[PDB]
Amino acid sequence: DPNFFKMVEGFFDRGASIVEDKLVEDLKTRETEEQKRNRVRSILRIIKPCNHVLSLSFPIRRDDGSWEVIEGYRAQHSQHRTPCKGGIRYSTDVSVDEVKALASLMTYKCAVVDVPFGGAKAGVKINPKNYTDNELEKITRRFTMELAKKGFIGPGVDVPAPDMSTGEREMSWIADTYASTIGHYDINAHACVTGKPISQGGIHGRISATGRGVFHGIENFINEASYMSILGMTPGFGDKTFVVQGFGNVGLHSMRYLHRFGAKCITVGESDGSIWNPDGIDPKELEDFKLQHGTILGFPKAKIYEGSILEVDCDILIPAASEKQLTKSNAPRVKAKIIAEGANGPTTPEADKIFLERNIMVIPDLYLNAGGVTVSYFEWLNNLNHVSYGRLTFKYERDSNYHLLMSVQESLERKFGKHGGTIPIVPTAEFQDRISGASEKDIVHSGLAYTMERSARQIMRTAMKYNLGLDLRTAAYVNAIEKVFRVYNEAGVTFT
Amino acid sequence: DPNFFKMVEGFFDRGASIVEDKLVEDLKTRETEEQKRNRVRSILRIIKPCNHVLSLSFPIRRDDGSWEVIEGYRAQHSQHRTPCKGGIRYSTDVSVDEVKALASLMTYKCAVVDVPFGGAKAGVKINPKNYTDNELEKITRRFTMELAKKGFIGPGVDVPAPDMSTGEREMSWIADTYASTIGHYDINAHACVTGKPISQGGIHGRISATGRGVFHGIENFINEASYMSILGMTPGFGDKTFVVQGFGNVGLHSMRYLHRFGAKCITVGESDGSIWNPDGIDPKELEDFKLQHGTILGFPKAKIYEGSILEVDCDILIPAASEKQLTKSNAPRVKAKIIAEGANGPTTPEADKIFLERNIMVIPDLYLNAGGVTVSYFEWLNNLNHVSYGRLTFKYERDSNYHLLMSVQESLERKFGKHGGTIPIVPTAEFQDRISGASEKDIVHSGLAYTMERSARQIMRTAMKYNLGLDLRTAAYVNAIEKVFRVYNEAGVTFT
Amino acid sequence: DPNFFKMVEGFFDRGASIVEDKLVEDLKTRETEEQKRNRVRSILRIIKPCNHVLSLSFPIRRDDGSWEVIEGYRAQHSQHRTPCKGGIRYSTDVSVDEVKALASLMTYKCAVVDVPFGGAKAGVKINPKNYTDNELEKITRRFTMELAKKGFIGPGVDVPAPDMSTGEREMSWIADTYASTIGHYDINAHACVTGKPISQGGIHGRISATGRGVFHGIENFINEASYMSILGMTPGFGDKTFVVQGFGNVGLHSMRYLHRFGAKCITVGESDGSIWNPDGIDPKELEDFKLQHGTILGFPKAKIYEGSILEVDCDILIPAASEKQLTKSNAPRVKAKIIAEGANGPTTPEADKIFLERNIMVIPDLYLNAGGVTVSYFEWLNNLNHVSYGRLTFKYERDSNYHLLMSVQESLERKFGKHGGTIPIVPTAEFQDRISGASEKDIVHSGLAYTMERSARQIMRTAMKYNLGLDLRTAAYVNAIEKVFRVYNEAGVTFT
């Protein structure tokens, strides 16, 4: 059991040395050779720490007439690209030594996916259960004023986001406090947060983003014939099983999309039980079960099978569980060729060194868990463009499709249809749903699939350039460190 | 040896309980009695902590072509009255746990003297000796940009100040970086710092402020016949000795003004020696000695007398030494009726409990060391009024003085001077220097004497209202806590 | 009983025609003669109306969980000089047709006293009794946000003020909502309101301002030997009586200062009784009576004497009562040579036409009731200079007084004191209190006496220039209209 901060700090040095050896050669600057080395050994010392760490204190008054002091935090990691997106975590285990880590984790998690803005995290030392709803907006509406008066919230500086125990309703209390106190004169005032409900500028298909994230991530590696061979699996999802730990937003929506392309959910683990049916599980039925029941423990159509789900015989683990969930105590007992981290840092840094020995491809959490980080970038743009995606072009592009089909029809009917007949060129029953059911949802899920795809093909490229084999995690950080470097380097890092 | 943070945190609770017992009765609010108690027990929980603590990280490049990371801090204590003044301390022993203390120390040190703005402190973990002058402006000019982009510098938010190892030249590098990058559009851009050299908006007679501070502070207690009796001394400075530890800006200028009203400097202690002559020391001669010599050790006209200067037989100790300088190990060996703290926290909290037993009046460091805090408030106004003090009225008030003397002359010459004679009513040789040598210096030293006087008469009042005897320190904090309370209370502490 | 709007609209035309006949001749502009007339007949059409009238609607939620809609108003009269000061009146009789009047009334009431900013009024249709204290800040803190987001509050646009049923505690709820939502980035954020309590930037001696106002106003007319003769009275307060209607802030403090210079309060009328003692009343004793009792009805040392107090035999009526309080039904029954309006529009426009027939000098409410309008201008400056008045110069001017006395002493002791004697030139027992008890209060009461004095000597001048006799009200409006005109005229009234 390590300290999560030393993990993310570890994967930097682990990656910093690799990239450096070629990152120096790629400098056509008019200096010596040992001053290039002392420029690359040096910027990396600047990317590693956290540039800003605020620390707050709130006069909040409970509804029973009892004042109290709330302690908060927020750490902007990198200023190289503004704004800086990062969720707000209401908890009690919040630590300034942890906010600095998850802030750094996002500077790179949104660099591997070519999302512009940097990384940040906030954290409020409150246990949400102990507060009435009138008291979680007195806290939220003042954690922003105190934080926006100091340039840590704003469409061009920081963009808070949801987190576990910080839902859709939280993000309205932030966007309304900002768009009425400080951001009033700013036209983009509602772009100060993401995850807002749809009635206030949220994007559609957001709650299924990390799901689509976890999906397209592993999709681009299952369909990689140059990796399935090395592992021992075949390309494609066909006749492959997956297992899910931590049923929830990331697990549930992942189950759906994987089960839609022939995969078979075998087990579903949670904090308080375990499920198993080697014939598979129906996501919707199990999704429906937890609605009334609140806990899948006792699912009818699948027997109970307790134990370490990380031992489950399968092909694909997907841990949506807590951080540091898979460690040496059970790493030699995976029974899965591919691990797909759905949460932040499930794999302790030792298991990765084990997994390259067991010949396991561990897809990192920088890449898979990007997910919402990308739609939370498409929602920032939605609010920053003041129009839903596609409203201007759904029907202009609908007409362009009917005319092509007509143009292909009439063109044939000159050659073949001369006999008075006709060729009713019509869209399929599928490309008809795509037309009649067009929505902003279809464009979000599209630009998300493109981001994951174009990015995975950049992790692969590095895993050959530097010959990392199945060490995709290291490959991910080398792309993250290399692209954050090209922003400091060509910018005259210091403003002097 | 305590932690300096627990000292300042101690004197709050020590004072918070005393003020509370009457601070509740003074509320004519439409509530119960136990909800007044739970409003006063509660605001005090809000005044005690530090509301904002930023923490920085700098890409600074040395002149030998070697980047490095500078770590800084700044803690705004109380937002009840903007701006928030606080010095910048270049050191290596800087600690975020220490900046929070000295920030709180200034919220009260400028409350006992009715200075409006709250308290703050900054700190940069650099040893100044290891940096060329071109590298102490690359640090200073970027410790402000990084700090002003986040609303921690500005004529209406924070006003940095000088400190030990942060001289007059530092404050120009801050005022020029602000008045040309961010504060450009603000007319008051040059009011963003104090302590600037006179050629850029500094006030005259600033380097002798803490001197005039230490002076008028003890003046208002030496001339208090209701305290000299209780101690065992007589009123006035006449035939009284004082001794100085830590010769320097606070010690030197204190020596001068005290030696000007009949006091006799006996010893002068430093870090590297000790001086003694029970006939006295001439300040100017000793001031001149350290100019060439750089260290008074070896002064001709006064023999060497080594040892704990805090043992020196005297009437008035003035420690300008380090913090926590006088402790139990030598507190029963003071040999001085009056201690006059010229630095921040020379007396460990135990010696005060000893000193009330030894019957010693320890004048606090909230009051005496205010000093520069008051002229650093008069310099903020100078730059905020865009005119030196008195330029409009030195000669308009000069004429009004000549006409009064003429009016008294002619009025007599009607009654007595009828005999052809005349009565040359002329100013004294002293009130002539005051006229011909009028300057902004004379108004600064005046409004400083008024602030110290009006404030000491408020410490005295509390020391009777709550019957603290010679425990002036506790009296000082009770006035500081009571006046910071009347700002939160009548303001609807929460903005909800 | 008229409509109060038609009164203030009446006194404009009544004054506009008089000033015009000379106001045209005073134009050295390169135009014709009939185009000067059509420039003066025209600007007066621009000064008369109200340039801006906002009208609000609030989602306020009672503490019993019941939303409701609050209806508010605010009318900026004249933009010729920014800001625009005007009180906020919580009532139910508030009418947009009344706010426009009292707004215009202040554009002139602060023009006769050379106060720069224009005039405005606000009004909220709520009965304050029906609202808990937690609900009069939810209203106050949102009547400002809704009003400051539209440029109707701010140190440079509008400066709200207290009013009846809008006390000191209201003005803190406005200054804190502004200085934390919108005016945060403005250094002058606390100058957005006046009347704030002393703990947040209020001026001392404010609650006794209208008192000092009513005093120095009638002082400058009682001591006018060229008016007492015409009426039938003698100069000075000596052996003269006054009577007060509407005991309260304006009546009480007026009683004190008048009774201090030999006047004799005869009666004290209120809404619910009447008092009389032709030997006089002691203000303090009667002031003390209403403290416990809450109503002077039943004062021991003065018998009850009911009836229309406006009939009381006296020399000076001072109605602090409601508006339109003295009308034709009792105007032929005044029994007072001098009426001194302490409220806004006590005299219906007909009684003035009666009073010039009865040969009565009615001092207007533009001039007397200025009062607080002047200290509410000195409090705006206090907050706008960030320093209490005199802190810099109380002791610099104290020293200049001791040196003059010493210079007169020594100068004599050269001529007379050559005999070894001495002449202890010391301040009086009165000019010693003035020194030892110097305060911002003494400067406020001074600059208030100067404003009233310099202004009354301008009403007198007009009452000769245009030969209005005892019609001082018309003289007041002609000075108000003439000085508001010289601001539009020399400014190119239109911005085209």
For A496, the closest of B50, B138, B495 (CB atoms) is B138
Q: Is the preceding peptide bond at B59 cis, omega within 30 degrees of 0?
A: no
Instruction: Specify whether the CB–CB gap between C175 and C193 falls below 8 A.
Output: yes
Distance CA B170, CA B122 (A): 13
Bridge partners, C123 (sequence order)? C73, C89
Strand B84-91 relative to strand B158-161, pairing: parallel
Which among C199, C386, C387 has the least Cβ separation from residue B490?
A: C199
Contact C145 A182 (CB under 8 A): no
Q: What angle do CA B93, B44, A52 make, to 5 degrees?
A: 40
Residue A426 sits at the chain B interface (C-beta within 8 Å) = no
Domain around B419: 201-496
The H helix count followed by the E strand count for chain C is 15, 13
Same domain, B469 and B397: yes
Q: What is the CATH classification number for the domain harbouring B484?
A: 3.40.50.720
Burial environment of residue B424 by CB neighbours within 10 A (0 to 12, 13 to 18, 19 or more): exposed
Alpha-carbon span B29 to C133, nearest angstrom:
9
By C-alpha distance, which of C5, C140, C120, C3 is closest to C52? Answer: C120
- Kind and range of the H or E run holding B6: helix B4-23
The DSSP bridge pattern shows strands A58-62 and A66-70 to be antiparallel
The span from the CA of C12 to the CA of C16, in Å, is 6
HSE-CB for B270 with a 13 A CA cutoff: 16
In contact, B84 and B48? CB cutoff 8 Å = no
For B85, the token pair is: 């003044």
How far is the C-alpha of C290 from the C-alpha of C303, rounded, in Å?
A: 16
Long-range own/partner contacts, residues C422-430 (CB < 8 A, 24 or more apart): C427/C401
A300 shares its domain with A189: no
Contact (Cβ atoms closer than 8 angstroms) between residue B175 and residue B383 = no
Sign of CA dihedral B101, B102, B108, B111: negative
User: Each residue of B344-369: b (16+ CB within 10 Å) or e?
Assistant: bbbbbbebbebbbeeebbbbbbbbbb
A66 in contact with B, Cβ within 8 Å: yes
Closest-CA residue to B185 (of B215, B154, B216, B158): B154
Closest C-alpha among A172, A173, A192, A170 to residue A183: A192
CA-wise closest residue to B75 among B49, B98, B103: B103
∠ Cα B434 B439 B442 (to 5°): 65
Scored b (16 or more CB within 10 A) or e, A232-250 reads: ebeeebeebbbbbbbbbbb
Work out the angle between the directed axes of helices C4-23 and C472-489 (0-180°, nearest 10): 70
HSE-CB at C229 with a 13 A cutoff on CA atoms is 3
Give yes or no: residues A227 and A371 share one domain: yes
Round to whole Å and give the CA distance between C292 and C273. Answer: 17
SS3 C241: strand
Residues B99 and B150 in one domain: yes
Q: Which residues pair with C67 in a beta bridge?
A: C61
Q: Are residues A19 and A56 in the same domain?
A: no
Tell me the two tokens of residue C422: 């001495």
Statement to judge: residues B248 and B367 lie in one domain: yes
The H or E element containing residue C339 is strand C338-340
Three-state DSSP state, A124: strand
Answer yes or no: is C186 a known binding residue: no
C455, burial (CB in 10 Å: exposed 0-12, middle 13-18, buried 19+): buried
Q: Which of B30, B51, B72 is the last residue of a domain?
A: B51
* Ligand-binding site membership of A109 (annotated): yes
Specify whether the CB–CB gap between B126 and B90 falls below 8 A: yes
CA atoms within 13 A on the CB side of C65: 1
Where residue A188 sits, what CATH number does that domain have? Answer: 3.40.50.10860
The pairing of strands C66-70 and C58-62 is antiparallel
3-class state of residue A152 by DSSP = coil
Domain shared by A292 and A372, yes or no: yes
Q: Is C55 labelled a binding residue? A: no
Using CA atoms, how far apart are residues B393 and C400, in angstroms rounded to an integer? 13
Q: Which residues contact B95 (CB under 8 A, 6 or more apart)?
A: B123
Q: How far apart are alpha carbons C23 and A117 in whole angstroms?
A: 65
| Exposed e or buried b per residue across C232-251, where buried means at least 16 C-beta atoms within 10 angstroms of its C-beta | ebeeebeebbbbbbbbbbbb
* Cβ–Cβ under 8 Å, residues B104 and B84: no
Q: How far apart are the first and last CA of chain B?
A: 43
- Output b/e per residue, C123-145; b: 16+ Cβ within 10 A: bbbbebeebeeebbbbbbbbbbb
Q: How far, CA to CA in Å, does B100 sit from each of A451, B119, C319, C406?
A: 45, 10, 57, 51
Asked whether the beta carbons of residue B405 and residue C406 sit closer than 8 angstroms, the reply is: no
B313, amino acid identity: D
Q: Give the long-range contacts of residues C394-400, CB within 8 A, separation 24 or more.
A: C394/B450, C394/C438, C395/B446, C395/B447, C395/B449, C395/B450, C395/B453, C396/B442, C396/B443, C396/B446, C396/B447, C398/C435, C398/C438, C399/B434, C399/B446, C400/B397, C400/B401, C400/B434
Cα-flanking dihedrals φ and ψ of residue C322, to 5°? -70, 175
Task: Locate A410 and state its tokens.
Answer: 């009439």
State both tokens at A283: 């996501």
Residues C25 and C74 in one domain: no
Q: Verify that B221 and B83 share a domain, yes or no.
A: no
Residues 153-192 of A with CB under 8 A from C: 180-182, 184
> Which stretches of A194-296 are DSSP H helices?
209-222, 225-231, 249-259, 283-293
d(CA C101, CA C121): 9
Q: How far apart are CA C109 and CA C85, in angstroms?
A: 11
Q: Which of B175, B200, B225 is the last residue of a domain?
A: B200
- Indicate the burial class of C336 (C-beta count within 10 angstroms; 0-12, 13-18, 19 or more): buried
Closest CA relative to residue A308, chosen from A273, A279, A282: A273
Q: Which of A227, A232, A235, A234 is nearest to A463 (CA)?
A: A227
Q: Identify which of B316, B324, B303, B306 has the alpha carbon closest to the alpha carbon of residue B270.
A: B306
Mode of pairing for the β-strands spanning A264-270 and A241-245: parallel
- Hey, what are B153's tokens? 């510098």
First vs last C-alpha separation in chain A? 43
CA–CA distance from A445 to each of A215, A247, A359, B149 (Å)? 11, 22, 33, 37
Both C397 and C465 in one domain: the answer is: yes
What is the identity of the amino acid at A203?
A: I
Q: Where are the alpha helices (DSSP H) in C48-167?
A: 96-109, 133-148
Show Cβ contacts of residue A291 under 8 Å, excluding neighbours closer than 6 positions.
none
The phi and psi torsions of C323 (rounded to 5 degrees) equal -80, 150
- Across the interface, whether the CB atoms of B53 and A49 are under 8 A apart is answered no
Among C330, C369, C353, smallest CA distance to C468 is for C353
The CA distance from A90 to the nearest CA of chain B, in Å, is 19
Considering only the C-alpha atoms of chain A, give the largest distance between any 2 of them, rounded to a whole number of Å.
89
**C-alpha span between C182 and C160 (Å, rounded):** 16
Q: How far apart are CA C180 and CA B476, in angstroms?
A: 30
Q: How far is A145 from chain C (nearest CA, A)?
A: 8
Asked if the peptide bond before residue A332 counts as cis, ω within 30 degrees of 0, the response is: no
For residue B83, cis peptide bond before it (omega within 30 degrees of 0): yes
Backbone angles phi, psi at B13, to 5 degrees: -55, -45
Mapped onto helix, strand or coil, the DSSP state of residue C122 is strand
If one counts every other C-beta atom within 10 angstroms of the C-beta of residue A199, the result is 8
Query: CB under 8 Å to B276, separation ≥6 — which residues?
Result: B266, B267, B302, B303, B304, B305, B312
Domain boundary among B180, B200, B220: B200
Chains B and C form CB pairs within 8 A to the count of: 96
Query: B437-468: buried (b, 16+ CB within 10 Å) or exposed (e) per residue?
Result: ebebbbbbbbbbbbbbbbbbebbbebbeebeb
The angle formed by the CA atoms of residues C419, C424 and C427, to the nearest 5 degrees, is 155
Report CA Rg, chain C: 25
The structure tokens listed for B335 are: 């040999």
Query: Which residues of C does the annotation mark as catalytic?
Result: 121
Among the partner residues A65, A67, A150, nearest to B52 by beta-carbon distance: A150
Among B427, B441, B365, CA closest to B108: B365
Nearest Cα neighbor of A211 from A474, A452, A477 is: A452
Rg (CA), chain B: 25
CA distance C462 to C471: 11
DSSP alpha helix (H) spans, C299-428: 349-355, 372-385, 394-415
Which residue is it, tokens 């030392």? A125
Helix (H) or strand (E) holding A374: helix A372-385
Subunits next to A (3 or more Cβ pairs <8 Å) are B, C
| A39 with B493: Cβ contact below 8 A | no
Cβ atoms < 10 Å from Cβ of B39 = 21
C225's CB contacts (< 8 A; 6+ apart) are: C235
Nearest alpha-carbon partner for B271 in B343, B354, B362: B343
List of chain B residues whose C-beta atoms are within 8 Å of the C-beta of residue A59: 43, 46, 488, 493-494
User: Among candidates B155, B191, B84, B214, which has minimal Cα distance to B484?
Assistant: B84
Q: Are C345 and C327 in contact (CB under 8 A)?
A: no
Closest chain A residue by Cα to residue C177: A181
Which residue type does C445 have?
H
Verify whether the Cβ–Cβ distance C406 to B428 is below 8 Å. yes
The tokens for A484 are 């954050």
Instruction: Give the C-alpha separation, A181 to A153, whole Å.
Output: 12
Tokens read off for A356: 């390259």
Residue A269: name the closest of A250, A288, A296 by CA: A296
Check if the beta carbon of residue C139 is closer than 8 Å to that of residue C109: no
- Rounded CA gap, C62 and B146, in Å? 44
Does residue A124 contact residue A74 with C-beta atoms inside 8 Å?
A: no
In the stretch 369-398 of chain C, residues with CB closer than 8 A to chain B read 385-388, 391-396
Which of A92, A112, A238, A103 has the alpha carbon at shortest distance from A165?
A92
Same domain, B146 and B87: yes
**Number of domains making up chain A:** 3
Task: Give residues with Cβ within 8 angstroms of A382, minimum separation 6.
Answer: A201, A203, A388, A389, A440
Question: Which amino acid makes up residue C352?
Answer: D
How many Cα neighbours within 13 Å face the side chain of B324?
Answer: 8
Q: Are residues C137 and C267 in the same domain?
A: no
CA distance B443 to B422: 35
Alpha carbons B76 and C195: distance in angstroms, whole number = 29
Q: How far, CA to CA in Å, does B348 sit from each of B102, C267, C479?
A: 15, 65, 68
> Measuring CA to CA, how many Å separate C396 from each of B116, B393, C435, C439?
21, 12, 11, 14
Q: A66 CA to chain B: closest CA distance, Å?
A: 7
* The two structure tokens encoding residue B413: 């010459």
Please give the Cα distance from B218 to B235 (Å, whole number).
11
Nearest to C210 by CA among C198, C195, C222: C195
A51 and A103 Cβ atoms separated by less than 8 Å:
no
Task: Kindly state whether B450 is in contact with chain C, defined as any CB-CB distance less than 8 angstroms.
Answer: yes
3-state helix, strand, coil in chain C (%, to 5): 50, 15, 40
CA B26 – CA C288 distance, rounded (Å): 20
Give every CB contact of residue A93 below 8 A, 6+ residues apart in sequence.
Answer: none
- Dihedral, CA of residue B368, residue B373, residue B374 and residue B380, to nearest 10: 180
CA dist., res. C311 & res. A112, Å (int): 90
* Closest to B490 measured CA to CA, from C137, C17, A157: C137
In degrees rounded to 5, what are phi and psi of residue A463?
Answer: -65, -10
CA A344, CA A339: separation in Å to the nearest integer? 13
Beta strands in C98-239 (DSSP E): 118-125, 158-161
**Which residues of B carry out catalysis?**
121
Q: Which residue among B56, B68, B488 places its CB closest to the CB of A51?
A: B56
